[PDB]
């Protein structure tokens, strides 16, 4: 399952049994001209994900744009009434209501 | 060239949070993509250093440096093929169908080559993943080319 | 403001203007705070809130000055909205450092001094964001419940 | 439209006509979205709802405008009936997969894109399709209960 990641040549490798097996320095070569050939791949393949990624932050941020504020100004007035005669006495009163 | 797109230049005021038309260094990478360019990470790193241009310290901006910056990040889009992003994932799994297991895709896109936070992994697989733990990536790369 | 809303405010003018003429004035004030146990009410604080008002208190001059002061009021419905959004998995009050940095990180109404004066009265849970719900009962009707 | 329906149109037709004549003018229309909260009600969305009729809006002109528009129409019971066919066990709300595709390979009016705005204001189990009876709660009586 490790070797999923790098931008390592999966064929310099082989598994079995007990143990891997691992080139140097050929078959090491090779894999190094691989490696590169993912960072390219890779790091292209990276970027738009990078990219992408953000791109759906954006979609959420600005959907939360008003559901803040909706909480944002909605504290703050009760953080001012709470305090308001009028407005306790609406407290003790709202439940014999109906 | 104008084709002169005067909508990036609207689009640096909803960016730039002070309002005196200048947006940091550490912005302009988002802000590339926001213009529909994907300039990977460390190529926007690059760029930058390779202009003497530290990213470290406090920085500035001018829409003059932004604009040319877009303009050079925009013959690189040329590297966003379709073929090579299913066959990447095609390879990924076994057998005639387009499915990774949820925590492949989810380990792999944080941990292998530019780091991606997994709150961002989580909102990339928001809804092209079921409950059966397989992302069927026909839909998903589409999804995510839709943006 | 919900029809609802405005029905309920109709409901609590009607109890504190204990006349029933359509104003309430400084009287009616005084005996609904003698029926709700205060027998020491100065006054001063009658004449406080109705110095809050350019004329008498009838109807669309209580609600435009409930109106005034509670321009940001929310009902426990879409406070339970967002609140649902915030744990969108459901049943789990969310984090206490989650909703410091999500409040400042978003906007500047959720700068911290302001958070800790948030996690003062709304006690720790509720300041914490674990809880939930006990805060958007407190925000439609204030006090210890 | 079974008559009891018709008899909720004609209290509907009623208390919008708070002049009692029979036909409803821009008038009524304004003093009923005012008695429900509206002080804000624009003349020009009481002229788009005047638009919509050929002539004056009596009781038979405001019948006709509803059936044009209500053309597929149901009755909560007639809904449950058709979902108790759906779920012929009882008590259980069906699944989700099950009315996706039972809604395309039936019909073109069950193809997906639809089903992704089904699944949109109605919401996952109504969506899902495991719950079962708010939805027609609300196609019957829309917004959210």
């Given at each position: ?58 979609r959420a941020m600005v ?36 | 060239s104008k084709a002169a ?143 | ?145």
């Open positions: 399952k490790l070797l999923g990641g790098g931008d390592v040549d999966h064929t310099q490798y082989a598994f079995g049994h007990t143990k891997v097996f691992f080139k140097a320095g050929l078959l090491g070569l090779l894999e190094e001209m691989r490696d590169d050939k993912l960072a390219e791949i890779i790091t292209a393949t990276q970027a738009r994900c990078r990219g992408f990624l953000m791109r759906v932050e954006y959907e939360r744009r008003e559901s803040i504020f909706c909480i944002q100004y909605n504290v703050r007035s009760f953080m001012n009434v709470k305090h308001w005669p009028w407005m306790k006495l609406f407290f003790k009163i709202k439940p014999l209501l109906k | 797109a005067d909508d990036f230049k609207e689009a640096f005021l909803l960016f730039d949070r002070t309002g005196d038309a200048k947006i940091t260094a550490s912005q302009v990478g988002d802000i590339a993509r926001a213009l529909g360019q994907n300039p990977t990470n460390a190529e926007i790193n690059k760029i930058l250093g390779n202009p003497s241009k530290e990213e470290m310290n406090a920085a500035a901006i001018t829409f003059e440096e932004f604009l040319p910056m877009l303009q050079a990040a925009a013959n690189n889009k040329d590297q966003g093929t379709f073929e090579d992003f299913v066959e990447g994932l095609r390879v990924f799994d076994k057998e005639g169908n387009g499915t990774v297991m949820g925590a492949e895709l989810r380990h792999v896109l944080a941990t292998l080559g530019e780091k991606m936070t997994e709150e961002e992994v989580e909102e990339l697989m928001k809804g092209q993943e079921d409950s059966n733990g397989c992302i069927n990536y026909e839909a998903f790369v589409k999804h995510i080319m839709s943006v | 403001f919900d029809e609802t809303e405005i029905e309920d405010f109709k409901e609590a003018f009607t109890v504190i203007d204990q006349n029933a003429d359509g104003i309430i004035d400084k009287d009616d004030l005084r005996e609904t705070f003698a029926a709700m146990g205060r027998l020491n009410v100065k006054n001063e604080e009658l004449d406080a809130m109705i110095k809050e008002a350019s004329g008498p208190i009838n109807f669309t001059v209580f609600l435009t000055m409930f109106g005034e002061k509670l321009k940001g009021a929310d009902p426990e419905d879409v406070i339970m909205g967002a609140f649902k959004v915030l744990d969108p998995d459901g049943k789990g009050s969310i984090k206490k450092s989650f909703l410091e940095e999500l409040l400042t990180t978003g906007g500047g109404r959720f700068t911290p001094e302001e958070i800790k004066n948030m996690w003062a009265a709304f006690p720790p849970d509720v300041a914490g964001n674990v809880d939930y719900k006990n805060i958007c009962y407190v925000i439609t009707h204030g006090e210890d419940a």
